[PDB]
Ligand SMILES: [Ca+2]
């Protein structure tokens with residue numbers, strides 16, 4: 001829901017990355033809808049993965065990225081989390097802020 005994605009695109013996507021170390025951010029962002037959502041929604045998501053409301057997705061909310069879409073879903077492996085944060089975290093503080101998230105989805 002949060003980001004107004006549909007179940008189908010969400011069930012699709014997860015199937016597509018259910019192997020360990022087959023997760024890829026922009027590919028799942030294309031997939032599940034999010035890379036063509038408005039920037040309002042690209043925020044609504046952000047704040048959902050920010051499970052603890054800190055303003056930031058820390059490395060440990062990032063590895064539970066999937067589960068925000070489906071509870072039973074798998075954790076990301078440590079490499080999968082290391083590339084994302086690698087791609088997201090331009091100021092090197094170890095966690096992703098909104099403006100960084102938005103930035104990595106595009107739009
Ligand atoms: Ca957080």
Ligand SMILES: [Ca+2]
Nearest residue numbers: 089091093095
């Ligand atoms: Ca950062």
Ligand SMILES: [Mg+2]
Nearest residue numbers: 051052058060
């Ligand atoms: Mg926390």
